[PDB]
Ligand binder design. Structure first.
Ligand SMILES: CN(C)c1ccc(-c2cc3ncccc3c(NCCCN)n2)cc1
Ligand SMILES: [Cl-]
Length: 269
């Protein structure tokens, strides 16, 4: 949707940055109330990527996915989104070390619900990481950052990339080796995201080059169990890290395992 620039107010507060430009906090006027927003502003191919990112967000409607308000064509191209005011999950857990395991399970289960919907909708995220999980509240997570997302063709269950700056530590072997991105590749990333969440926002494969990560994975080696991570949660991360794409579970199976485990945790102690 095309938004009116006069109805938008930008704050000095920078929420994010990259080659595209920045993300700033703002306020947008709705029919009656005013809405707090996060605005992706482009620096003045880069314009087309923003419109495709808006096109994907327009098509998604789920409680666990950041809602887009619209696009604003003014001093620059802007993508206006509802703000998840607690911000990225990795930074939040680095600053709040006392969040319980039950609370982490709850948040990771919400991400899996959002991804089950994306899988059902036949979109591939291609940038699933804890930095792209945003907190609305300490008990409500949403998936953001659809800049690399693709709508799958009607005849294929994967997107084939033509070019190769990629978040390689979050990518499945088939992505790195064959440039093929499927919902199962997003499951691998989700396993890295789970490790990050139970490691209170620690970076995965710390001190390792992307090429050293690839070699460790090719040898059947994986990151260890995070300190105090429940065994059932670590077993699920390893299942997400199944090398062969055909034996790796899809998001329906991942979400069901997280649902049953979470409702078992809440029913106990
Ligand atoms: C508390 N704090 C430091 C903070 C930082 C970032 C956000 C925030 C919220 C957003 N909400 C909706 C869409 C994008 C959002 C965004 N984006 C950019 C990077 C995300 N990988 N950042 C909020 C608070
Ligand atoms: Cl990386």
């Amino acid at each position: 949707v095309y938004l009116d620039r006069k109805l938008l107010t930008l704050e000095d507060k920078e929420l994010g940055s990259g080659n595209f430009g920045t993300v700033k906090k703002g306020y947008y006027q709705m029919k009656k109330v005013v809405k707090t927003v996060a605005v992706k502003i482009l620096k003045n191919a880069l314009k087309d990527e923003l419109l495709a990112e808006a096109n994907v967000m327009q098509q998604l409607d789920n409680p666990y996915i950041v809602r887009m308000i619209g696009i604003c064509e003014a001093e620059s191209w802007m993508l206006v989104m509802e703000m998840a005011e607690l911000g990225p999950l990795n930074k939040y857990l680095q600053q709040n070390r006392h969040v319980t395991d039950k609370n982490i399970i709850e948040l990771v289960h919400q991400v899996s619900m959002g991804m089950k919907y994306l899988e059902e909708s036949n979109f591939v995220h291609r940038d699933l990481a804890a930095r792209n999980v945003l907190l609305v509240t300490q008990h409500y997570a949403k998936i953001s950052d659809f800049g690399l997302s693709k709508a799958l063709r009607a005849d294929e269950n994967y997107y084939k990339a033509q070019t190769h700056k990629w978040p390689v530590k979050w990518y499945a072997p088939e992505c790195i080796n064959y440039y093929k991105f499927s919902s199962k590749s997003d499951v691998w990333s989700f396993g890295v995201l789970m490790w990050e969440a139970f490691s209170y926002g620690q970076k995965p494969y710390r001190g390792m080059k992307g090429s050293e990560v690839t070699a460790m994975l090719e040898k059947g080696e994986r990151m260890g169990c995070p300190a105090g991570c429940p065994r059932e949660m670590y077993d699920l991360m390893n299942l997400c890290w199944t090398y062969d794409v055909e034996n790796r579970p899809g998001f329906a199976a991942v979400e069901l395992r997280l649902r049953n485990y979470y409702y078992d945790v809440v029913n106990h102690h």
